[PDB]
Scaffold this active site. Sequence first.
Site, short mmCIF file in Angstrom:
data_model
loop_
_atom_site.label_atom_id
_atom_site.label_comp_id
_atom_site.label_asym_id
_atom_site.label_seq_id
_atom_site.Cartn_x
_atom_site.Cartn_y
_atom_site.Cartn_z
N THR D 97 0.84 -1.22 0.00
CA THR D 97 0.00 0.00 0.00
C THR D 97 0.88 1.28 0.00
O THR D 97 0.52 2.25 -0.70
CB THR D 97 -1.00 -0.04 1.17
OG1 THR D 97 -1.81 1.14 1.04
CG2 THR D 97 -0.33 -0.02 2.51
N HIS D 119 -7.21 13.99 -7.02
CA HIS D 119 -7.09 13.48 -5.64
C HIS D 119 -6.34 12.16 -5.75
O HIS D 119 -6.82 11.31 -6.47
CB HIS D 119 -8.47 13.23 -5.04
CG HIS D 119 -8.45 13.08 -3.56
ND1 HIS D 119 -8.24 11.88 -2.93
CD2 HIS D 119 -8.64 13.97 -2.58
CE1 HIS D 119 -8.30 12.04 -1.64
NE2 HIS D 119 -8.54 13.31 -1.40
N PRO D 120 -5.18 11.95 -5.08
CA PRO D 120 -4.45 10.68 -5.17
C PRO D 120 -5.34 9.45 -4.94
O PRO D 120 -5.31 8.53 -5.71
CB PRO D 120 -3.35 10.82 -4.11
CG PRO D 120 -3.09 12.29 -4.10
CD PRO D 120 -4.47 12.91 -4.22
N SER D 129 -8.01 -0.84 -4.73
CA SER D 129 -7.86 -0.75 -3.27
C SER D 129 -6.39 -0.70 -2.94
O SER D 129 -5.57 -0.76 -3.83
CB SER D 129 -8.55 -1.88 -2.60
OG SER D 129 -7.68 -2.99 -2.60
N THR D 177 33.36 -39.76 -15.59
CA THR D 177 32.23 -40.14 -14.69
C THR D 177 32.88 -40.30 -13.32
O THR D 177 33.92 -40.95 -13.31
CB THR D 177 31.55 -41.43 -15.14
OG1 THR D 177 32.48 -42.50 -15.12
CG2 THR D 177 30.97 -41.34 -16.53
N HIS D 178 32.27 -39.73 -12.28
CA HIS D 178 32.87 -39.72 -10.93
C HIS D 178 34.21 -39.00 -10.93
O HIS D 178 34.98 -39.23 -9.95
CB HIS D 178 33.05 -41.13 -10.37
CG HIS D 178 31.87 -42.04 -10.42
ND1 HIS D 178 31.00 -42.17 -9.34
CD2 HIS D 178 31.44 -42.92 -11.35
CE1 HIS D 178 30.11 -43.12 -9.62
NE2 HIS D 178 30.34 -43.57 -10.87
N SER D 309 45.84 -11.43 -11.78
CA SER D 309 46.68 -11.27 -10.58
C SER D 309 47.88 -10.39 -10.90
O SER D 309 48.30 -10.39 -12.06
CB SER D 309 47.13 -12.60 -10.08
OG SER D 309 48.39 -12.53 -9.46
N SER D 310 48.35 -9.67 -9.90
CA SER D 310 49.59 -8.87 -10.08
C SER D 310 50.77 -9.69 -9.56
O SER D 310 51.90 -9.45 -9.99
CB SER D 310 49.47 -7.58 -9.38
OG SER D 310 48.69 -7.70 -8.19
N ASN D 317 41.83 -15.64 -15.36
CA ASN D 317 40.87 -16.39 -14.50
C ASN D 317 39.53 -16.52 -15.22
O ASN D 317 39.18 -15.64 -16.01
CB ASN D 317 40.80 -15.68 -13.16
CG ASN D 317 42.06 -15.82 -12.36
OD1 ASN D 317 42.76 -16.85 -12.42
ND2 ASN D 317 42.32 -14.79 -11.55
#
Lengths: 451, 448, 450, 458
Positions: D97, D119-120, D129, D177-178, D309-310, D317
Amino acid sequence: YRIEHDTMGEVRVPAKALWRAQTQRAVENFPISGRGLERTQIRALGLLKGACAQVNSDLGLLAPEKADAIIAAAAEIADGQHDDQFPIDVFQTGSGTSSNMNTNEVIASIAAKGGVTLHPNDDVNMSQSSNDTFPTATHIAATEAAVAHLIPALQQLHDALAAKALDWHTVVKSGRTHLMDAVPVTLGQEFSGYARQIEAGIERVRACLPRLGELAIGGTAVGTGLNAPDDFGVRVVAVLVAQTGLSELRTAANSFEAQAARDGLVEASGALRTIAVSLTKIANDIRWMGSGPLTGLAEIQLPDLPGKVNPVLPEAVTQVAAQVIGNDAAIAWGGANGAFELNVYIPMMARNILESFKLLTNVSRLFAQRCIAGLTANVEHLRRLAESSPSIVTPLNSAIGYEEAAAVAKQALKERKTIRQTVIDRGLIGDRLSIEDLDRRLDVLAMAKAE
Amino acid sequence: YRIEHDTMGEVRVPAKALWRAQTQRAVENFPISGRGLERTQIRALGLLKGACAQVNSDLGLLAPEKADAIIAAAAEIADGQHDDQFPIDVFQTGSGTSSNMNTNEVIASIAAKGGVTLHPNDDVNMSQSSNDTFPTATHIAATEAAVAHLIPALQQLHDALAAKALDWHTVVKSGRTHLMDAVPVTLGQEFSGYARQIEAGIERVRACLPRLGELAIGGTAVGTGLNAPDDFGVRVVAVLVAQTGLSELRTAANSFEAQAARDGLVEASGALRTIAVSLTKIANDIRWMGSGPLTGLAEIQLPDLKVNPVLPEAVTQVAAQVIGNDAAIAWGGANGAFELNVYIPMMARNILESFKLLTNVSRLFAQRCIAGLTANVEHLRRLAESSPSIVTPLNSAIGYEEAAAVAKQALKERKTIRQTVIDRGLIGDRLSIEDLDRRLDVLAMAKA
Amino acid sequence: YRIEHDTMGEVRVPAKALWRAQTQRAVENFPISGRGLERTQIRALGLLKGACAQVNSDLGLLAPEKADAIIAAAAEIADGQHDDQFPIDVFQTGSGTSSNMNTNEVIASIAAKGGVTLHPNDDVNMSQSSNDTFPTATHIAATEAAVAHLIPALQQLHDALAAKALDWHTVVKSGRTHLMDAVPVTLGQEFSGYARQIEAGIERVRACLPRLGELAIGGTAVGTGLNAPDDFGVRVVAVLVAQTGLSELRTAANSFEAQAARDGLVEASGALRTIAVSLTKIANDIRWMGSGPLTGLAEIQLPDLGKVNPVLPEAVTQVAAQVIGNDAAIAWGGANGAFELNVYIPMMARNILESFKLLTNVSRLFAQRCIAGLTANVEHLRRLAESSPSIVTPLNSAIGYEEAAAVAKQALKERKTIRQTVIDRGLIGDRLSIEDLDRRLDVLAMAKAE
Amino acid sequence: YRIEHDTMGEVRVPAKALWRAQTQRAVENFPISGRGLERTQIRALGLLKGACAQVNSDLGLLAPEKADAIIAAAAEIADGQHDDQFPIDVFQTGSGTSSNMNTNEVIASIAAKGGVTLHPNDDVNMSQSSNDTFPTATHIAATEAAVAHLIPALQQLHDALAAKALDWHTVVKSGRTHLMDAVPVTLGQEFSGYARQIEAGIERVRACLPRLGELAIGGTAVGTGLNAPDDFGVRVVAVLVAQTGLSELRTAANSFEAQAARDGLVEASGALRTIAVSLTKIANDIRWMGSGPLTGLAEIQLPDLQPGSSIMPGKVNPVLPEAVTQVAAQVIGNDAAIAWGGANGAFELNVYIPMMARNILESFKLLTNVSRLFAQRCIAGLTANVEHLRRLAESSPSIVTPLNSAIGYEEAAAVAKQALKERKTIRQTVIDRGLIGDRLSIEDLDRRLDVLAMAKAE
Ligand SMILES: COc1ccc(S(=O)(=O)N2CCCCCC2)cc1NC(=O)Cc1ccnc2ccccc12
Ligand SMILES: COc1ccc(S(=O)(=O)N2CCCCCC2)cc1NC(=O)Cc1ccnc2ccccc12
Ligand SMILES: [Mg+2]
């Protein structure tokens, strides 16, 4: 725009921006959420860069004039003057490399305005890696949020609940179990329960601090400390403890665990999730107690933001708790998925746990001040219902028998009368017991075992 | 196949069953999961009934003949002799009153065999309610699980990981960050990290015990202690501490909190979930280290039970289950109303399972996977000798500026630091080959 | 206490056990939960092994005497006659290979008693691998659970809620928003909403079936179908559909997706989790409506199993919490597959199949032993609706919002109807007739029911 | 600054603010998160208020000058012109609301600048509503996010994965697999699997739209439609569908269910959660395949997007797979908050809407944005290490099985043992044991050990 460079080449950057080439690549690589680091995260990165420069200065690794420019620029960052210079998405490289570089580039650009040339990597990032800095800043921010903000907010909510517990010590009312009427309690006893849940919450936050305050700083790229002084970690933590006053900050017990995992954030989020569970129970009970004004329980009136007020702060508290529960699932998911030397979910885990701290802190203070403090009880109404409940006929059994106690309970409900009045109306006084005995047996405040 | 008489009718009960009509009604009411209380929960209900009868006897509320019969029957239940007499579904009335009455009825039937007549409610349930009993037995079971079973299993896993951390202190290998090649580490350093995660897990479990061990007993229907002696809870807890040796059992700090909420189970589940997160990272690294052996990393060999990493898979599957059980616990925890949280049987099932799974898989992981791992030492050193190097360890020999020039040219030409130093003609009086090789040594770079 | 000789030494197997050495090694390797496969799991493994033997026989790969022996043994497993011969923990190798081997060994032992020698691997596992069998059985069990058991149980609940919606069509009562009094509704309208939630639940289950029914069978070890006939999957699926009548079973759209992931289980768990959410709202509203008999809402009375504890709403909300937790475990296993195989299948199967079972059983109990017997406090509900400040707004055009506020305040203070309050304040006259007042305060008309 | 007057006193509002007293009280009441409605929610509120003014004008309930001013202001909001005028916290009254009133006040202020007084509540909120509006805007936003943004972004990722599947049709490699060595597959087959996961993800989103698109508008305070025209909901739906082209928007099947519950959002979040699970598997496989380049699997190379990376200067990455797996974790968290809110409605209203809306709309946005970035900046530029992959397939013990019928399973297992010990191809190990003879020619060995044929590519 202006041209800037990195190990990958040339990049166009906003002419006026304090950041440089790496920050600009990150801006173009990660347009995902549209949200960047929060105030607390930037503050923590500024605090850490200033502490690193101080220690590098103290070990004679960094020229006093460079260290002073870094310390002054990092103080400006920590105080919030350059928040608009941190445009990188939360959803960036999972080490937080990008935001570490953002801090380094902004510090170099500030320093240059004061006529000092600092390199983002060689001087600002001296003795450091992204792998150790972003998790350290995250744990500083989380430890500060726990100690300085959430524990005091919870203490304010505890005290507001404990004040109601005392104010309502004799406000007898029906007990409810399974939502069904049960033997008497007081509103004060129920509020003493809510207070205990919040006090236990504080104990849960305090219990996690020995691991939440562990900092990775000094471990460098993989936890070995290569390219850093052997005592960098202890010296930096000592500087942070002196600047913040957060005695909970400490060097990690194991430098590998501190970078390979973020299990301290997972643990801390569990404490916050437990607090969210407690607040849901407290807020739901309060909105139900204030329900009505005609067709609900109508036990208490919540202050307006009559007895027709919508329970808007219970709704805010329960929505916050739902959010903390979601954030907690995201945190655990990132925590589990580290590989080898580094957990690469740090920016997402930091976003979630710092949000959970902030929401619990803010809603707890609002709930304490603008709902709990102003609750009023329908005292006489509550007592009348307690005195009218079939649950209190049991102590008559030994005087009038089971069958007659049941007939008293049925008649009191049908005629909307007290148990005492129904016992008198049925003509039970004299043969079975006296008025004195009736008043002893049906004293609902004594049944609640309050005084 | 006997017949029993109840307030709304006749109840038919199996003949060798020691439960009576209320339990049989609950069996008919809740055919939902087809699974009932676990041995740990049954044990805790027996312990609680014996302690309550001990205290009622000591207060002179219960005749010694009746108290002795309850105590003897309760000791049999606590010793696991009647695990087949509790048929009620887990998904029952949310107070656990059905399982409470199941316990009362089985004790009454056991006592009748020894020639004593007990009323399930008035004797076996004396000073207790339908609402403070099942949560107390739940917290007893959870505290026993934590202290007697989980912590020792975790300590076994910690000790197995720490033993590897020491064996492999100098087994150098490449570090990996973002799954990409990084500077050297040792296998022992990585195992020292795993060991710390499990040690921190033990600290996390210990930290929850002050609240996990809180018992509701004595608070009766709503927390007020109506119809119980004022000191019932303190006396019952002392009897349980003496009989179990569990010093972590305590009276609730607040009797209303202890019945309106099960926050101690939610807290404890959080610790178990953090252990599951740690175990996931440890198990995932171990299966990746054992992967291949031609297509994978081939860093270690797992004991065979081309070996599939079956114990890492059991661990990660258990961790997923603990994460799911933790979400169920918190959902129940949040949804209490007024004087009672009515999710207790479901919360109890989930937390007690999470304790059991973690206890059992931790011991198996320690004994049948970690203890038998073997390192492929030569392979690992060949990986370390392929890691990126840095110029810093040359600074004292060639100065900050030549080092920076070695770094720049190594990057531009995609050369190692070692070869770049050689190609730039830097081998001389300032830096021998020996001194180059000592400065860049991969085990030295790991700083073990 | 009979003895067996494995590739790795001596194993003692119980005497009345129909499993063999590989099962007994798995019993020794995985003492984790002490809970093995559920009856629906075991049935599906039997159905699958029967269909595979049928196909291998049809293609001339398996001698018919061996195929007949597998078919008869698998039928006994599918019929639930050997539920005690599956002792391996749920927490086993994550392909479910151990439970696959358990099925193969039990079939060989049943066949042996009838004079036929079957090799568990070579004959009972012919054309199958260690990786496409258990997930196929899991999807057969979950699809059967959805179509044969959960949808009919939800339809029973829908029909019970709908019956009450119709019975309570004119049972006007105060509406509640934010737990506060609101304009009138009927108990029938509220029950029509509950009914829609359950009918939408059935739609959600129906919508997942195209992907829940996908079977991996025929993909073999990695999804390529190497070492199986090219048409093994469509042949086996056709046999399963013909035998079971489950038309929702189908070959996988992509054989690699069907083994690398279990996304259909994650999808179906989401539908079950949504139903759990709906049931939580329905069960919580019903227990609140039955709260009392004095200090609660006292809108309805629940049947005993005014003072009855709401034990079946408590069972329903506890089941819903379990289904939420199970759903989190399923998603966690789902996400964590690697390359050619997701190795969380036993754990995902336990959780999905439990969620189906709990929702099926509790939905029928809730329909039959709670919903069908609810009674409404009809006159009490109407009196409260007629006494609510929320209904004074239709007076404003006759007496003004200020006098309508005065009526509301006095009606509440004196515990009177708005109608009696308007008459007590002497407002009947030329400004408002008694008929005009009755029209304006018609609370059942304000609810706008059919 | 500029002062205003409420029913509870005097409110100070910023000068350039188009909101009024109620919004300012809500700003003071809920300082919780410091985050307010997103642009998608603000746009849906604008769309809804314009449609409602159109309908109220059509039914003769609202004067045409007033309706035109509302339609003009509501179009400015829906076009993103007033995204700084909605300051209320997400964590507000649970019906939404406060944000509904924010919209009404902002529209009234925009109309005032053009000399029309609205009127709002009595004009901008006519026939509506405080309880059927915010959930309607939520469902409009979520439906638009699904149909117009997420499904196209997922189609782009599908098409990128499917294009790699075709390019790598013949790129043989060992299966895993696995995490252990398995029989051959092609990189194209694996990417065909990833594409099917995303195509199934689109099927899951379409499957929820019949219920996600259901709108509560017309049901008013409790779902009965008291104080609205009997056909308000169908009229407003007709206007929204005509103006937006969003054919999935519909009037709720049951007006009570559409306000008492937000089950459509819980359903939709389940689809997004399933997509997060699929994306996690795809992104994790891709970063593992790109791992190394010397100590990992080195099956493919990802396009370089930034310095990683430095300390290790040339290290690059898998930053896009990391962004994807972090997004997926966020969606699984968001999903848990949505289900928690969905479950906890009471009677005629679920009062978790602002929190459920924040979470569901963020999940759609993150998945949409990260899917597009993953397709364009990672998948499209992948390259395969074809000769590495084939070398490993040709050296695998897994490929000896087709030799069984020539030399027997015992000798095949001997070839496997020797090849793995001596780091040789199976083909060479077979020759190095002198098995080329009477039951096996050199062309017959090459036919049995054809690793691409073993992958059985269509
Ligand atoms: C659960 O709510 C109830 C339960 C029972 C009964 S009863 O019928 O058994 N009975 C007992 C009380 C004595 C008067 C006669 C009525 C009423 C109620 N509620 C109310 O009185 C509601 C109410 C109306 C007006 N002013 C109020 C002012 C404060 C609080 C509530 C108010
Ligand atoms: C939310 O519950 C309430 C809310 C308001 C009121 S009131 O005070 O405003 N009120 C209005 C009703 C007319 C006479 C009494 C005055 C009472 C109530 N409860 C009850 O009457 C409780 C009750 C007692 C006895 N028999 C009952 C049989 C069925 C249902 C409930 C019963
Ligand atoms: Mg390799």
